[PDB]
Design a binder for this molecule. Structure first.
Ligand SMILES: CNC(=O)c1cc(C(=O)NC2CC2)n(Cc2ccccc2)n1
Length: 111
């Protein structure tokens, strides 16, 4: 079950990183460089940064023991975006679209 469910998670992760979703996935590829972007309040508002490169490293290192732990990091990434940004910002529209991809495929988890 656990290996099988984590392979489903790895499949989802590969899809989120694939060219298919690149138009709206790209802000989530790497850690937010707050200083580079002039977001000098980012790390005061976001206590637990998360991004797909960190999720990929954790998957590669067999850090995730189950699908629930993987999903918590993916949703933390989206939640950080919804917490920090005005809700009408382009990056929030991009987060909503990538979260739709994630949630619909995560829901197809093998039992
Ligand atoms: C996960 N990334 C973020 O939460 C984030 C927040 C921001 C940003 O500049 N937000 C403004 C309101 C202060 N940016 C830069 C960006 C990405 C896409 C399109 C335009 C700007 N990425």
């Amino acid at each position: 079950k656990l290996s099988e469910q984590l392979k489903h998670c790895n499949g989802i992760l590969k899809e989120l990183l694939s060219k298919k979703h690149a138009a709206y996935a790209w802000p989530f590829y790497k850690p937010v460089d707050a200083s580079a972007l002039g977001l000098h309040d980012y790390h005061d508002i976001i206590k637990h940064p998360m991004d797909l490169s960190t999720v990929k490293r954790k998957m590669e290192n067999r850090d995730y023991r189950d699908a629930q732990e993987f999903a918590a990091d993916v949703r933390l990434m989206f939640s950080n975006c919804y917490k920090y940004n005005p809700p009408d910002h382009d990056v929030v529209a991009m987060a909503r679209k990538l979260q739709d991809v994630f949630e619909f495929r995560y829901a197809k988890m093998p039992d």
